[PDB]
Write a protein that holds these residues in place. Structure first.
Motif, PDB file in Angstrom:
ATOM      1  N   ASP A 135      -1.188  33.447  11.947  1.00 59.49           N
ATOM      2  CA  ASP A 135      -1.687  32.943  10.677  1.00 59.49           C
ATOM      3  C   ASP A 135      -2.569  31.723  10.886  1.00 59.49           C
ATOM      4  O   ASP A 135      -3.695  31.661  10.381  1.00 59.49           O
ATOM      5  CB  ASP A 135      -0.501  32.619   9.781  1.00 59.49           C
ATOM      6  CG  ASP A 135       0.378  33.826   9.535  1.00 59.49           C
ATOM      7  OD1 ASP A 135      -0.140  34.959   9.587  1.00 59.49           O
ATOM      8  OD2 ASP A 135       1.591  33.655   9.301  1.00 59.49           O
ATOM      9  N   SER A 164       2.702  31.803  10.540  1.00 59.83           N
ATOM     10  CA  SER A 164       3.022  32.028  11.940  1.00 59.83           C
ATOM     11  C   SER A 164       1.858  31.588  12.823  1.00 59.83           C
ATOM     12  O   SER A 164       0.876  31.000  12.360  1.00 59.83           O
ATOM     13  CB  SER A 164       3.374  33.496  12.160  1.00 59.83           C
ATOM     14  OG  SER A 164       2.246  34.322  11.940  1.00 59.83           O
ATOM     15  N   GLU A 185       3.553  42.626   8.070  1.00 55.27           N
ATOM     16  CA  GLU A 185       2.813  41.684   7.244  1.00 55.27           C
ATOM     17  C   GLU A 185       1.473  42.275   6.835  1.00 55.27           C
ATOM     18  O   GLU A 185       0.631  42.577   7.684  1.00 55.27           O
ATOM     19  CB  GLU A 185       2.623  40.371   7.992  1.00 55.27           C
ATOM     20  CG  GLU A 185       3.939  39.687   8.278  1.00 55.27           C
ATOM     21  CD  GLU A 185       3.776  38.288   8.839  1.00 55.27           C
ATOM     22  OE1 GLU A 185       2.657  37.921   9.242  1.00 55.27           O
ATOM     23  OE2 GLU A 185       4.769  37.538   8.839  1.00 55.27           O
ATOM     24  N   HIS A 215      -0.844  37.087   2.859  1.00 51.12           N
ATOM     25  CA  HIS A 215       0.031  38.103   3.428  1.00 51.12           C
ATOM     26  C   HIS A 215       1.459  37.698   3.085  1.00 51.12           C
ATOM     27  O   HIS A 215       1.683  36.795   2.273  1.00 51.12           O
ATOM     28  CB  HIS A 215      -0.193  38.248   4.933  1.00 51.12           C
ATOM     29  CG  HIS A 215       0.316  37.096   5.728  1.00 51.12           C
ATOM     30  ND1 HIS A 215      -0.217  35.833   5.629  1.00 51.12           N
ATOM     31  CD2 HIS A 215       1.265  37.029   6.686  1.00 51.12           C
ATOM     32  CE1 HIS A 215       0.413  35.028   6.462  1.00 51.12           C
ATOM     33  NE2 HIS A 215       1.310  35.732   7.124  1.00 51.12           N
ATOM     34  N   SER A 216       2.430  38.356   3.702  1.00 50.48           N
ATOM     35  CA  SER A 216       3.833  38.118   3.407  1.00 50.48           C
ATOM     36  C   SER A 216       4.551  37.592   4.640  1.00 50.48           C
ATOM     37  O   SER A 216       4.072  37.741   5.760  1.00 50.48           O
ATOM     38  CB  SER A 216       4.512  39.397   2.931  1.00 50.48           C
ATOM     39  OG  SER A 216       3.907  39.865   1.744  1.00 50.48           O
ATOM     40  N   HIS A 217       5.689  36.938   4.433  1.00 50.12           N
ATOM     41  CA  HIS A 217       6.658  36.700   5.500  1.00 50.12           C
ATOM     42  C   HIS A 217       7.970  37.273   4.989  1.00 50.12           C
ATOM     43  O   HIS A 217       8.847  36.531   4.525  1.00 50.12           O
ATOM     44  CB  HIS A 217       6.769  35.229   5.880  1.00 50.12           C
ATOM     45  CG  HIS A 217       5.532  34.681   6.518  1.00 50.12           C
ATOM     46  ND1 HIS A 217       4.536  34.066   5.795  1.00 50.12           N
ATOM     47  CD2 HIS A 217       5.114  34.679   7.805  1.00 50.12           C
ATOM     48  CE1 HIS A 217       3.568  33.689   6.608  1.00 50.12           C
ATOM     49  NE2 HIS A 217       3.893  34.051   7.835  1.00 50.12           N
ATOM     50  N   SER A 263       1.753  41.456  11.666  1.00 52.67           N
ATOM     51  CA  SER A 263       0.971  40.232  11.488  1.00 52.67           C
ATOM     52  C   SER A 263      -0.490  40.338  11.912  1.00 52.67           C
ATOM     53  O   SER A 263      -1.251  39.393  11.694  1.00 52.67           O
ATOM     54  CB  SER A 263       1.602  39.055  12.245  1.00 52.67           C
ATOM     55  OG  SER A 263       2.884  38.734  11.752  1.00 52.67           O
TER      56      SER A 263
HETATM   57 ZN   LIG Z   1       2.829  35.720   8.705  1.00 46.37          ZN
END
Ligand SMILES: [Zn+2]
Lengths: 287, 407, 95, 32
Positions: free
Chosen positions: A103, A100, A29, A90-92, A60
């Motif tokens: 996050d 998450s 991430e 950010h990305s998942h 992450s």
């Molecule tokens: Zn994330």
């Protein structure tokens, strides 16, 4: 909690920076900050996106280097537009894009600086051509669960939020998270020059060049694939003449018996390519 | 042709009302106003030259042709005629049918017995309080329905639906029994069901001249001063819900209360109620404060101005007002201002049939989805009842083509 | 129709409600007392026969389809001289 | 009744004009 109308504006450069930087570092991430302008209560307008540098090689984990903040915002001050930070992203990359634990961990520390600094999630995997998928969120407290959470002005946005949607775990994360609508405004200058690019620059330079190259194809290369076409349109045909016979044999049109089909329509469309580019010969070659 | 049609109505046929249902045919399928008046104006010449007295036909053409002098002519003749029984129907259907400019322009011709009669017929309040008397003497409702829809308790928007429902089933009754029976369930949602409750108060009190201000003096904002913003801002909105279509001391009441007030929490109900009482009335002196309401540089009062700036100018198409609206709603950074002025520029043009098309093409032109949607509302409002197939083509065409969902 | 973007736009619907009542007044204020007939059956009149009965002016509530099945009172004292084809305020003439 | 029975048919002629124009653009749009 006390809510407002839910609305997030964009910049067209933003989405591209999102997809590029979330693609180039895909399995981890990738942190990135987000830059724009708090215009009012209910609309937020991101106008600029710069990505964050990476660190140690783990999922992450995120950081905000303040000397990077000072130097990057300093460069954007000597660039034409300095403006205020509005959040981050950010990305998942492998899933249905929920924030998450890390996050929400950086969110409860980041929320003390700005109220409506919206966390955004790009995904360069679950989008193919007809999805962004833009996905932004907003954290809720735990102190205000004595009070309600439910004014939700301009009701359409919430009922719109529940449709782009799946999971059991997003359904478990309607607590701690309520999303916010994202929409797109496009410069007609930019729209028309992207139309220039992608309806004109897929045609190539000087524009005669590749069509006269098709004219080069039409007398040297086409006859080989014409031989391939003629061999296909003999070999496929003497067994697809068994097909209306066996339609009369088996039933009136029941379930699929076996493998093959007619498939001739595609080969005929290739022959139509042959004839249209043969029509190109007279037009290009003469005058 | 006009005069061969005048020859066909000058015949030797027993005609009770062929010259009435053929007028229904003239109103039903008419191409343009250029021909409707040409049919209609000589028919009433033969009606006032006809031997039998007939008032429904001259009343019909009177409310159609929008003449502020012919109504005064036949009213002068029926007050001179000294029978208030026949000077009754024309006067009250007169108050019923047409607009406010028509009556407020013929009121000068009526004061150019005879002085009390124009007050009786052109103010026309007593008909509204007569049907209001019917609404208070007639109460056929049910509380059990609201019990069943009450004990489905959710803390959601549903509060607004419940208070708008018990304002629906208690229109014109002037009774606050749902302020009598409970006090804490009303005080559950914040600021918005509270604006909806203090406006549902006004929904109960439509067309209520007598006890209006003294009944809503509980919620006047300058004395009690609640901590909720729209709660104190909803009183003037409820007053405008009361006195819609008519102007009185409400104009001169709010006109200085919208000057000296709180911040942009009170203007949202104030200008809405003021242009709702002044709806279709073309009052310039509310348009004046609506100008600074437009240029507040805020869109939550931009919607105050966006509703009221069309509301005060219904069916007028003030050519500078279109300029004001579309020239403020292009460079703005918000969207509530855009949508309010969208409704406003739709509302200013009303029943023109061709005269909106220069604006309609311009509103079709823009890349703005809000402004294309605005042109759709404008072609919706300028063509009310228009069976002409000029609008429907581009209307349903952009209902096919355009990419935004709301448009 | 557009009530999301301003929740107080559920309130303008009260101005859509219109009077549907059969009135008739002999002077500017005076109420006489009279009941006239309808030609329908007494079960479609409900809002929870030889004739139905209406009011004397409060006016009576009415159906927009029952505006033609009424009949002016031919045997009672007060009679509306104008042809009564809708509700609203009209003349109720004494003979 | 022939004034009415002739004038009301122009409405349906206009309607068939409208839908014949309309389904063409619908058919073009649905492939996109
Ligand atoms: Zn994330």
């Amino acid at each position: 909690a006390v809510d407002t109308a839910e609305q997030v504006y964009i910049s067209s450069l933003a989405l591209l920076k999102m997809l590029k930087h979330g693609r180039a570092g895909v399995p981890m991430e990738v942190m990135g900050l987000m830059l724009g302008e708090f215009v009012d209560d209910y609309t937020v307008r991101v106008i600029d996106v710069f990505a964050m540098p990476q660190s140690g090689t783990g999922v992450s984990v995120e950081a905000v280097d303040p000397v990077f903040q000072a130097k990057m915002l300093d460069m954007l001050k000597q660039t034409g537009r300095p403006e205020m930070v509005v959040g981050w992203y950010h990305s998942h990359p492998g899933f249905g894009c929920w924030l998450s634990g890390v996050d929400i961990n950086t969110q409860q520390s980041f929320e003390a600086l700005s109220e409506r600094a919206v966390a955004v999630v790009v995904d360069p995997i679950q989008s193919v051509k007809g999805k962004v998928v833009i996905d932004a969120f907003r954290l809720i407290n735990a102190n205000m669960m004595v009070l309600g959470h439910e004014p939700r002005q301009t009701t359409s946005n919430l009922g719109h939020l529940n449709k782009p949607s799946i999971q059991a775990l997003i359904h478990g994360l309607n607590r701690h998270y309520y999303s916010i609508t994202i929409n797109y405004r496009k410069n007609e200058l930019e729209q028309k020059m992207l139309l220039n690019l992608h309806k004109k620059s897929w045609m190539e330079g000087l524009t005669l060049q590749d069509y006269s190259e098709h004219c080069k194809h039409n007398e040297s290369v086409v006859k080989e694939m014409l031989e391939l076409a003629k061999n296909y349109n003999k070999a496929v045909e003497e067994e697809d003449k068994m097909t209306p016979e066996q339609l009369a044999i088996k039933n009136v049109g029941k379930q699929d018996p076996k493998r093959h089909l007619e498939e001739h329509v595609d080969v005929l469309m290739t022959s139509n390519i042959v004839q249209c580019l043969a029509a190109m010969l007279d037009t290009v070659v003469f005058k | 042709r006009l005069d061969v049609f005048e020859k066909t109505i000058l015949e030797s046929n027993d005609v009770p009302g062929m010259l009435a249902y053929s007028l229904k045919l003239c109103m039903s399928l008419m191409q343009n106003k250029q021909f409707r008046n040409k049919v209609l104006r000589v028919l009433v010449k033969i009606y006032m030259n006809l031997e039998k007295p007939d008032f429904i036909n001259v009343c019909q053409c009177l409310i159609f042709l929008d003449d502020p002098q012919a109504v005064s002519d036949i009213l002068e003749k029926l007050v001179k005629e000294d029978n208030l029984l026949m000077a009754y129907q024309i006067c009250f259907d007169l108050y019923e049918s047409a607009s406010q400019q028509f009556l407020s322009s013929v009121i000068q011709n009526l004061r150019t017995d005879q002085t009390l009669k124009m007050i009786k017929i052109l103010s026309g309040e007593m008909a509204i309080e007569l049907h209001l008397q019917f609404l208070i003497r007639n109460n056929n409702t049910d509380l059990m329905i609201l019990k069943n829809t009450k004990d489905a308790v959710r803390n959601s928007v549903c509060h607004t639906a419940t208070v708008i429902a018990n304002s629906f089933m208690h229109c014109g009754t002037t009774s606050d029994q749902f302020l009598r029976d409970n006090l804490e369930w009303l005080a559950r949602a914040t600021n918005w069901a509270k604006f909806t409750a203090t406006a549902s108060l006004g929904v109960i009190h439509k067309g209520h001249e007598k006890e209006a201000l003294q009944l809503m003096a509980t919620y006047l904002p300058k004395d009690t001063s609640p901590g909720s913003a729209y709660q104190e801002g909803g009183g003037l909105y409820a007053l405008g819900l009361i006195h819609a279509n008519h102007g009185g001391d409400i104009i001169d009441y709010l006109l200085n209360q919208l000057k000296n007030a709180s911040n942009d929490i009170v203007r949202h109900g104030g200008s809405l109620g003021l242009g709702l009482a002044a709806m279709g009335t073309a009052r310039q002196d509310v348009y004046d404060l609506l100008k600074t309401n437009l240029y507040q540089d805020d869109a939550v009062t931009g919607e105050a101005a966006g509703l009221a700036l069309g509301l005060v100018m219904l069916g007028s198409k003030n050519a500078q007002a279109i300029e004001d609206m579309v020239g403020y709603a292009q460079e703005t950074q918000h969207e509530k201002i855009l949508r309010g002025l969208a409704v406003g520029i739709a509302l200013v043009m009303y029943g023109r049939m061709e005269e909106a098309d220069a604006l309609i093409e311009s509103l079709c032109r823009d890349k703005d989805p809000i402004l294309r949607r605005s042109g759709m509302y404008t072609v919706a409002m300028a063509y009310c009842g228009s069976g002409n197939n000029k609008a429907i083509r581009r209307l349903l065409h952009v209902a096919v083509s355009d990419v935004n969902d709301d448009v | 129709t557009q009530f999301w973007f301003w929740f107080p736009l559920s309130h303008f619907l009260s101005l859509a409600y219109t009077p549907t009542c059969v009135i008739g007044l002999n002077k500017d204020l005076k109420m006489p007392k009279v009941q006239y007939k309808s030609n329908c059956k007494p079960s479609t009149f409900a809002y929870p026969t030889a004739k139905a009965k209406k009011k004397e002016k409060n006016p009576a509530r009415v159906m927009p389809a029952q505006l033609k099945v009424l009949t002016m009172p031919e045997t009672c004292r007060y009679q509306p001289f104008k042809p009564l084809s809708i509700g609203g305020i009209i003349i109720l003439k004494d003979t | 009744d022939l004034y009415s029975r002739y004038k009301k048919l122009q409405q349906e002629l206009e309607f068939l004009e409208v839908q014949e124009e309309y389904i063409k653009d619908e058919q073009k749009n649905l492939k996109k």
